[PDB]
Design an enzyme around this catalytic site. Structure first.
Site, mmCIF file in Angstrom:
data_model
loop_
_atom_site.group_PDB
_atom_site.id
_atom_site.type_symbol
_atom_site.label_atom_id
_atom_site.label_comp_id
_atom_site.label_asym_id
_atom_site.label_seq_id
_atom_site.Cartn_x
_atom_site.Cartn_y
_atom_site.Cartn_z
ATOM 1 N N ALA A 139 20.948 64.245 72.024
ATOM 2 C CA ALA A 139 19.682 64.190 72.724
ATOM 3 C C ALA A 139 18.779 65.133 71.922
ATOM 4 O O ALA A 139 18.297 66.135 72.442
ATOM 5 C CB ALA A 139 19.852 64.693 74.154
ATOM 6 N N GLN A 142 14.605 64.904 66.927
ATOM 7 C CA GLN A 142 14.364 64.169 65.682
ATOM 8 C C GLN A 142 13.726 62.815 65.962
ATOM 9 O O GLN A 142 14.324 61.968 66.618
ATOM 10 C CB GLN A 142 15.673 63.926 64.910
ATOM 11 C CG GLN A 142 16.450 65.172 64.492
ATOM 12 C CD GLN A 142 17.668 65.450 65.369
ATOM 13 O OE1 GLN A 142 17.572 66.115 66.406
ATOM 14 N NE2 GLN A 142 18.822 64.933 64.952
ATOM 15 N N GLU A 143 12.514 62.620 65.452
ATOM 16 C CA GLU A 143 11.800 61.367 65.624
ATOM 17 C C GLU A 143 11.199 60.932 64.293
ATOM 18 O O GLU A 143 10.382 61.647 63.699
ATOM 19 C CB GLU A 143 10.674 61.508 66.643
ATOM 20 C CG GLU A 143 10.001 60.191 66.937
ATOM 21 C CD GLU A 143 8.691 60.353 67.680
ATOM 22 O OE1 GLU A 143 8.102 59.303 68.046
ATOM 23 O OE2 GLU A 143 8.256 61.516 67.886
ATOM 24 N N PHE A 223 14.370 47.705 54.062
ATOM 25 C CA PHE A 223 14.954 46.461 53.571
ATOM 26 C C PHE A 223 14.896 45.352 54.625
ATOM 27 O O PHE A 223 15.525 44.309 54.432
ATOM 28 C CB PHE A 223 16.387 46.687 53.051
ATOM 29 C CG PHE A 223 17.266 47.467 54.022
ATOM 30 C CD1 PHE A 223 17.726 46.861 55.189
ATOM 31 C CD2 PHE A 223 17.590 48.790 53.760
ATOM 32 C CE1 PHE A 223 18.499 47.538 56.093
ATOM 33 C CE2 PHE A 223 18.376 49.515 54.653
ATOM 34 C CZ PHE A 223 18.838 48.891 55.827
ATOM 35 N N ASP A 296 27.633 61.862 60.389
ATOM 36 C CA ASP A 296 26.806 61.064 61.307
ATOM 37 C C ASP A 296 26.815 59.534 61.058
ATOM 38 O O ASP A 296 25.835 58.851 61.368
ATOM 39 C CB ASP A 296 25.365 61.576 61.213
ATOM 40 C CG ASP A 296 24.561 61.339 62.497
ATOM 41 O OD1 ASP A 296 23.320 61.194 62.431
ATOM 42 O OD2 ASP A 296 25.172 61.312 63.573
ATOM 43 N N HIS A 298 27.512 56.904 62.572
ATOM 44 C CA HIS A 298 27.782 56.205 63.823
ATOM 45 C C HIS A 298 27.416 54.719 63.746
ATOM 46 O O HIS A 298 26.867 54.280 62.729
ATOM 47 C CB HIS A 298 27.045 56.918 64.996
ATOM 48 C CG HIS A 298 25.585 57.086 64.785
ATOM 49 N ND1 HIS A 298 24.716 56.006 64.701
ATOM 50 C CD2 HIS A 298 24.816 58.195 64.643
ATOM 51 C CE1 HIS A 298 23.492 56.448 64.520
ATOM 52 N NE2 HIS A 298 23.518 57.776 64.480
ATOM 53 N N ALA A 299 27.690 53.969 64.814
ATOM 54 C CA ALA A 299 27.463 52.521 64.828
ATOM 55 C C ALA A 299 26.063 52.063 64.550
ATOM 56 O O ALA A 299 25.907 50.967 64.069
ATOM 57 C CB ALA A 299 27.922 51.882 66.150
#
Length: 421
Positions: A139, A142-143, A223, A296, A298-299
């Site tokens: 949470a 970072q944006e 891409f 990091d 992750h999916a």
């Protein structure tokens, strides 16, 4: 309560938010009759009926930042009706990842060329306790944003005009009980990791560090976009991440939270139009992440292009950050986002992983041992020259500590390969 859904200039269907808040989706009959009809997501197969499963809500929710903190910031920035996908997408669903353009049932190539001053203002507006968790993407605050590159100027697109680059700002410092993960140099960190992957022959996007006044950011070429020859029309390319393709909520993007890992994705890649190479590249990328202390993966950091007819194949790898520059945090605390299923239990501890683990995991996944040896043998021989080549190309102002931290740690781990290959 309806957002009409378009893939570039073709009408695909419509997302409805009912009075009770459920999100439902229906394909347009004309799209279903389209020559190269493809689903909006592999989790939303083409069908005539109204789709009401949770895969609908999850797919669209996955187009927005997963961090509640960022969502609220977005909700306030546009005064959206709620934190719900439909309401936030009603404001920013014009340009997102892939080719999903959402238009309120109510209501190109235009933009605002940014000046040195406007650029800084725009980017600065996006930048501005924890636990025994070393994950970079929680949470967090970072944006990332996106900009349109036209000629030699950065621009903000108008209307449904797309962007060409994803812009990332420094993550900053993540503080925990008795330590702090200094990610203030994540822009240089990622730039370096992308250069290294490229040098090693892995499929990743080109990126450049951009500097506006006091802002230092990473501009990553997208891409999921492609210019026509005249550079007058920018088309979007359908793509979705692994949470979306499996119909899962972004809440479970990490395997440690119940998300998909190597075995599920590898099985899914058997169905890729280029299954052979995609499975090889995906496994090669697991060895790469081990080598560079990337925790990091992750999916949501793996995606597939959805091609005509629903055919699919892996997109390049992206969002690569090494945890090595954070050490100062112990090496033994670094864990891969997706573990190596050995036999006695998935291994995630980077400092405890050796080549035998990749070979063992390969065996269980029915990934040809010869291929795994080919991958390991390649990094055994190329890593040192690759690091030196990448170092030499870095910009004049690149932070030495980042290079040193990554180089030294990769070399330490590479020692385990050169001993067997």
């Amino acid at each position: 309560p309806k957002l009409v859904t378009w893939m570039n200039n073709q009408r695909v269907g419509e997302l409805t938010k009912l009075a009770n808040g459920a999100h439902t989706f229906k394909y347009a009959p004309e799209w279903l009759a389209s020559r190269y009809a493809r689903p909006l997501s592999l989790s939303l197969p083409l069908q005539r009926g109204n789709i009401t499963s949770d895969a609908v809500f999850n797919f669209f929710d996955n187009l927005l930042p997963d961090s509640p903190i960022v969502r609220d910031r977005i909700v306030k920035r546009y005064h959206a009706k709620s934190r719900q996908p439909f309401d936030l997408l009603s404001e920013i669903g014009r340009d997102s990842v892939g080719a999903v353009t959402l238009i309120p049932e109510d209501e190109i190539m235009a933009w605002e060329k940014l000046t040195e001053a406007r650029l800084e203002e725009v980017l600065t507006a996006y930048k501005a306790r924890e636990e025994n968790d070393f994950r970079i993407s929680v949470a967090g605050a970072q944006e990332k944003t996106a900009l349109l590159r036209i000629g030699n100027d950065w621009c903000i697109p108008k209307g449904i005009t797309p962007t060409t680059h994803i812009i990332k700002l420094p993550i900053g410092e993540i503080r925990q009980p008795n330590a702090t993960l200094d990610l203030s140099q994540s822009v240089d960190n990622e730039y370096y990791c992308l250069l290294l992957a490229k040098e090693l022959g892995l499929n990743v996007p080109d990126a450049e560090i951009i500097k506006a006044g006091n802002v230092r950011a990473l501009a990553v070429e997208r891409f999921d976009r492609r210019w026509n020859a005249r550079r007058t029309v920018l088309l979007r390319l359908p793509q979705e991440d692994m949470c979306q393709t499996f119909g899962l909520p972004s809440s479970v993007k990490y395997e440690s939270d119940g998300g998909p890992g190597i075995a599920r994705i590898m099985a899914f890649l058997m169905g890729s139009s280029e299954a052979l190479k995609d499975r090889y590249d995906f496994m090669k990328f697991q060895v790469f992440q081990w080598l560079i202390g990337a925790t990091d993966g992750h999916a949501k950091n793996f995606s597939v292009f959805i091609q005509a007819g629903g055919s699919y194949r892996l997109t390049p790898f992206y969002d690569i950050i090494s945890a090595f520059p954070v050490l100062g945090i112990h090496i033994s605390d670094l864990k891969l986002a997706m573990g190596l299923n050995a036999s006695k239990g998935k291994k995630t501890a980077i400092d405890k992983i050796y080549p035998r683990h990749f070979l063992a995991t390969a065996k269980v996944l029915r990934f040809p041992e010869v291929q795994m040896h080919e991958i390991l043998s390649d990094f055994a021989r190329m890593i040192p020259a690759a690091l030196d080549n990448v170092k030499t190309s870095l910009p004049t102002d690149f932070p030495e500590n980042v290079v040193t931290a990554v180089e030294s740690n990769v070399l330490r781990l590479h020692g385990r390969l050169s001993r067997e290959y």
